[PDB]
Amino acid sequence: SAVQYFQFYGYLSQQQNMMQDYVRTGTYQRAILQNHTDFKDKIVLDVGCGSGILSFFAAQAGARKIYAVEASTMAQHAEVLVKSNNLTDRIVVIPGKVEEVSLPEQVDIIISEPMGYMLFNERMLESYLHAKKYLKPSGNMFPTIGDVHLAPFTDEQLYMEQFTKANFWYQPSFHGVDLSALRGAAVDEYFRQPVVDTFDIRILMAKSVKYTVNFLEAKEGDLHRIEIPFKFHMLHSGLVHGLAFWFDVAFIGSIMTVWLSTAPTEPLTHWYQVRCLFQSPLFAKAGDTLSGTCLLIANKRQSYDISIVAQVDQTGSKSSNLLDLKNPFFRY
Numbered sequence: 001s002a003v004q005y006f007q008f009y010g011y012l013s014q015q016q017n018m019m020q021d022y023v024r025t026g027t028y029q030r031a032i033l034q035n036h037t038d039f040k041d042k043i044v045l046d047v048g049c050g051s052g053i054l055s056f057f058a059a060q061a062g063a064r065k066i067y068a069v070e071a072s073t074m075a076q077h078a079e080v081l082v083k084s085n086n087l088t089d090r091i092v093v094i095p096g097k098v099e100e101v102s103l104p105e106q107v108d109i110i111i112s113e114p115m116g117y118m119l120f121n122e123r124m125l126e127s128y129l130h131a132k133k134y135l136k137p138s139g140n141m142f143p144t145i146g147d148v149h150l151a152p153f154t155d156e157q158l159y160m161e162q163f164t165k166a167n168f169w170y171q172p173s174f175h176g177v178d179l180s181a182l183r184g185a186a187v188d189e190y191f192r193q194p195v196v197d198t199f200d201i202r203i204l205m206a207k208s209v210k211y212t213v214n215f216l217e218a219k220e221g222d223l224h225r226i227e228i229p230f231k232f233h234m235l236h237s238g239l240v241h242g243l244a245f246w247f248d249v250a251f252i253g254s255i256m257t258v259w260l261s262t263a264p265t266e267p268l269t270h271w272y273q274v275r276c277l278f279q280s281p282l283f284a285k286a287g288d289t290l291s292g293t294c295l296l297i298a299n300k301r302q303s304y305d306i307s308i309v310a311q312v313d314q315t316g317s318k319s320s321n322l323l324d325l326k327n328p329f330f331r332y
């Protein structure tokens, strides 16, 4: 399963998909170059460098030595880019997992792009935090912090489409076969899929809750289990069909903080946004409070189980769902 995960990152087409996200690439370049004093003549560790583009940005900012660590066979293409760019003196590509490789020295700054869907998908943040064993005291992290946002949404058409799909199985004679006994299992399977898509911000029914991970302070085991209580104060009346998720990360440099946002108010990125449906919708009047917990539990497939319990406090109407982020539905 981890084998499949790294093979995916060995394709230049996948690297190209990430590089052509101008929000992503341009913000990292701004973050590094406009904080050139965090890089001028320092030692840099680039965790999961892929083609090496962030290592070149750190070179452009004046770093004297960058260790670029990469587990996929993309590391071979990265070394070709270091030669052809005449940077063999300053960029050393180290093939392997950051947990296994040897660094020759401690570093001043760690750079990486370890954000998956919903921030945490693919569990790359664990490698990122694990690399802190090479960070000097008062070293920096780029990105420095991550904010997950949660917000309730209404989207009757997204909810209904799940049943339209599963009702294929509610047929007493599909070519003469009664399929209806599998309707519930099919419904169950569709609702366990987080929906990757963007959406109009007017579907949001309350201001988002924010959960912050400080990468300078977090330990790797802090990401095995992530409990996010929420209390939403409903700004609109309607049926809540589930929770929408997006994230921001900040690069907190000596000169300035640069923000990379995937919010639905911001230009689209290849992370889009993520929505998780409730099993049953919940009615809330403007002014009601929607309260509950989102519990992320790391699983065997480099991903998370998502457990969401929610209730309308004024009413007692409760709903839940348990989702698996490894099998998302790409609706865009």
Ligand SMILES: CNC[C@@H](O)CN1CCCc2ccccc2C1
Binding pocket: 014, 015, 017, 018, 048, 050, 113, 114, 115, 116, 117, 124, 270, 271
């Ligand atoms: C370097 N690490 C970036 C990774 O975190 C980006 N990921 C974003 C989610 C979707 C996606 C689409 C195409 C290629 C890769 C990915 C994964």
